[PDB]
Amino acid sequence: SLEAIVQNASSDNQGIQLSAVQAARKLLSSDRNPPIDDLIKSGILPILVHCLERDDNPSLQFEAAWALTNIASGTSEQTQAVVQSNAVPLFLRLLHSPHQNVCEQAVWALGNIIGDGPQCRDYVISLGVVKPLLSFISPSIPITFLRNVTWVMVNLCRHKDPPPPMETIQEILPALCVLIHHTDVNILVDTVWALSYLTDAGNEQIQMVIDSGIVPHLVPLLSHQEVKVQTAALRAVGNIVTGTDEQTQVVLNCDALSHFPALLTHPKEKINKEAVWFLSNITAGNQQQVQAVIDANLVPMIIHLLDKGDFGTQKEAAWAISNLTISGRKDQVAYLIQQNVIPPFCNLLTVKDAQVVQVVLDGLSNILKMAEDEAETIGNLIEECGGLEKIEQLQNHENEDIYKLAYEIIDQFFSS
Amino acid sequence: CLGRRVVQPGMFADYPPTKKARVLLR
Secondary structure (H helix, E strand, O other): OHHHHHHHHHOOOHHHHHHHHHHHHHHHHOOOOOOHHHHHHOOOHHHHHHHOOOOOOHHHHHHHHHHHHHHHOOOHHHHHHHHHOOHHHHHHHHOOOOOHHHHHHHHHHHHHHHHOOHHHHHHHHHOOOHHHHHHOOOOOOOHHHHHHHHHHHHHHHHOOOOOOOHHHHHHHHHHHHHHOOOOOHHHHHHHHHHHHHHHOOOHHHHHHHHHOOOHHHHHHHHHOOOHHHHHHHHHHHHHHOOOOHHHHHHHHOOOHHHHOHHHHOOOOHHHHHHHHHHHHHHHOOOHHHHHHHHHOOOHHHHHHHHHHOOHHHHHHHHHHHHHHHHHOOHHHHHHHHHOOOHHHHHHHHHOOOHHHHHHHHHHHHHHHHHOOOOHHHHHHHHHHOOHHHHHHHHOOOOOHHHHHHHHHHHHHHOOO | OOOOOOOOOOOOOOOOOOOOOOOOOO
């Protein structure tokens, strides 16, 4: 019973202590519904934390660390109970234990604490977790331990309110440059995910990632055999190309677009959608980057997904098409016209997602505005496929912006 | 409005867990 366990764990006889701590650990690690609240209420947390101090009994440290790991794997309130009982400085102490298993379990427990959120993370960082954590990365580290270390690095990179301190990013990035060459799938997926959490953190973090020289090693992972690596890489480099034209161009200079045929045709619709999101962030750049997309023979695939894809991919393809018109030259838009973009583009005008309707109308407006002489021909194409009837109907749309733009388009181009 | 966009909801839903329990026999 919990009462007896707590009593025996407070004991000064460490054989009885160990048996009781192991019984608590068993309650916490037998299934996926451990009674964390009951064990917290019983008052065991201070006892487990005290057990963490027993350098003379590594078994007790390990078992207590395991129990605390599992308590900390629960809700924010339960993780915080672990933090409130002063567990963190003692885990940091155990990071320098001579016994590997004590060290590993302390790393795991800290991973759960760090994962709870940015304020916990920043407490742990302020006490100096990063350098000891990274110090375990060496040729002899067991692969299971290294997987835990890399997951902890994910947790150090991922929260955004606020993001991790710049110093911490500067310490972590060289380790990620080391780990991106590992062939263990788990380590590689977690490495690329940590990178993606850095590249989603802002232009300055993106530039830190670029300056580290790692992007040339990241881009080829878009064609890794493991789809989990492929999608993690798609996220990391996609976040990069959400930034400036120059950062996007760093990505394009690693032959990124070469990897996309196998992603636009992937059987998984979610992958098509994510690839088309990436490409829409490319077509929103300057004329050279639009041309990069064109020269890679990707537009017909984008237009096919716009026509026949699932609605999420269709939405992302509508974005890619419309974004092309921001800085695209008349000849680039003309290429799109040649590729039968208008019928499926216009077919998207009757969907329920007002954002898609707006995107399509903005694109059509820019296309017509750009075409000086061909405006009449493009209008004839829009009418041919039923697009004009759809715009006319949109004049009665609920959304202010949509019906205003429908009026604008009709008046400026279909009122001769 | 047209332009670049950040990761959209529902994309990359298979993120690494924030927390992991150590389960005996798993």
